[PDB]
């Protein structure tokens, strides 16, 4: 198992503009297009991201190309964030995947805000951080996905995904 596969399981793949769990226009593998309520706006962003007139539909390769940029971007965001970097550096390969997943989903700012759990992750207090991670909107809105990530942090294995 690896980061790409993990995230592909969590976000799925759609070749046509869709709405996310929050009602936002998305496409491909969890690629947020816009938070605007307008499909046109979504469409224009899409065209701009792909570089062609797409009319709301992309190919598999295109979805994969956006996905590679997005994963790369998330990793770099972690590496550049003063609060995230230390955390990522202190972790094993599997747990690094767990933090990258959260960043892909909720952004750097989002994750950076889990102050306490972050500190707990740094101290390698697995059980405690996991409990803290569950007291959040994130866990309450996407409980199945949050459980998977949270188990990954607790255990350090890919079991929740196997
Ligand atoms: Cl983009
Ligand atoms: Cl879920």
Curated annotation (Swiss-Prot):
Endolysin with lysozyme activity that degrades host peptidoglycans and participates with the holin and spanin proteins in the sequential events which lead to the programmed host cell lysis releasing the mature viral particles. Once the holin has permeabilized the host cell membrane, the endolysin can reach the periplasm and break down the peptidoglycan layer. GO terms for molecular function: lysozyme activity. Optimum pH is 7.3. It holds the Pfam family Phage_lysozyme. The active site is at 11 (proton donor/acceptor), 20 (proton donor/acceptor). This is Endolysin. One of its GO terms (biological process) is viral release from host cell by cytolysis. Substrate binds at residues 32, 104, 117, 132. Its main location: host cell. It catalyses: Hydrolysis of (1->4)-beta-linkages between N-acetylmuramic acid and N-acetyl-D-glucosamine residues in a peptidoglycan and between N-acetyl-D-glucosamine residues in chitodextrins. SUPFAM superfamilies: Lysozyme-like. Induction: Expressed late in the viral replication. Gene3D superfamilies: 1.10.530.40. The keyword Hydrolase applies. Belongs to the glycosyl hydrolase 24 family. Changing residue 11 to A/F/H/M/N: Complete loss of enzymatic activity. Its EC number is 3.2.1.17. GO terms for cellular component: host cell cytoplasm. The keyword Hydrolase applies. InterPro entries: Endolysin_T4_type, Glyco_hydro_24, Lysozyme-like_dom_sf, Lysozyme_dom_sf, Phage_lysozyme-like, T4-type_lysozyme. It is found in: Host cytoplasm. It comes from the Viruses. Keywords: Antimicrobial, Bacteriolytic enzyme, Cytolysis, Glycosidase, Host cell lysis by virus, Host cytoplasm, Hydrolase, Viral release from host cell.
């Amino acid at each position: 198992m690896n980061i790409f596969e993990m995230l592909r399981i969590d976000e799925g793949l759609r070749l046509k503009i869709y709405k996310d769990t929050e009602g936002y226009y998305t496409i491909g593998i969890g690629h947020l297009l816009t938070k605007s309520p307008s499909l046109n706006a979504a469409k224009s962003e899409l065209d701009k991201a792909i570089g062609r007139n797409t009319n709301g539909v992309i190919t598999k390769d295109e979805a994969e190309k956006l996905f590679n940029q997005d994963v790369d971007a998330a990793v770099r965001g972690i590496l550049r964030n003063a609060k995230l970097k230390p955390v990522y550096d202190s972790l094993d390969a599997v747990r690094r995947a767990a933090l990258i997943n959260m960043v892909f989903q909720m952004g750097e700012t989002g994750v950076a805000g889990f102050t306490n759990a972050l500190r707990m992750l740094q101290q390698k207090r697995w059980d405690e951080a996991a409990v803290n991670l569950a007291k959040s909107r994130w866990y309450n809105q996407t409980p199945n996905r949050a459980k998977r990530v949270i188990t990954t942090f607790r255990t350090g294995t890919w079991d929740a995904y196997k």
